[PDB]
DNA sequence: TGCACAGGATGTATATATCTGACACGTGCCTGGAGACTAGGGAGTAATCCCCTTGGCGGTTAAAACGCGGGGGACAGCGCGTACGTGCGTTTAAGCGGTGCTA
């Protein structure tokens, strides 16, 4: 809340898909506009 | 005249008996159990060294799965033609028991 009000871009690393996973629910759950790349994207989907 | 029955004739289901198979009881011999000797294969023991999961984990891939089109394979109907089913008359040789040999 406070980067979004500086109007700042953050990336969250994580270890674990899983919460990889609850955080797209929660991301959604806020409507961040969020984009997601991990070992499963596809190749061409990843550069894009 | 034709019927009733007195006197007599083949037959036969009923009844009494003779003509064939199988099981139990008697001999008697190649035995089965038993006694003792036997040892070396089995079983108890002890490493020992090697192969089998750890355990879920992500980042991937090859194979599995799921969806769809369609077109041709399966298949229920059925026209019809015949070649197997049922039923003769007729023949063969398969079955029966018998006699004599033998390999």
Do not use: P, S, W
Request: proline share 0%.
């Amino acid at each position: 809340q406070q980067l979004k009000d500086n109007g700042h871009r953050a990336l969250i690393f994580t270890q674990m898909t899983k919460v990889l996973d609850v955080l797209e629910q929660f991301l959604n759950y806020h409507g961040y506009l969020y984009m997601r790349l991990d070992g499963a994207t596809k190749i061409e989907d990843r550069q894009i």
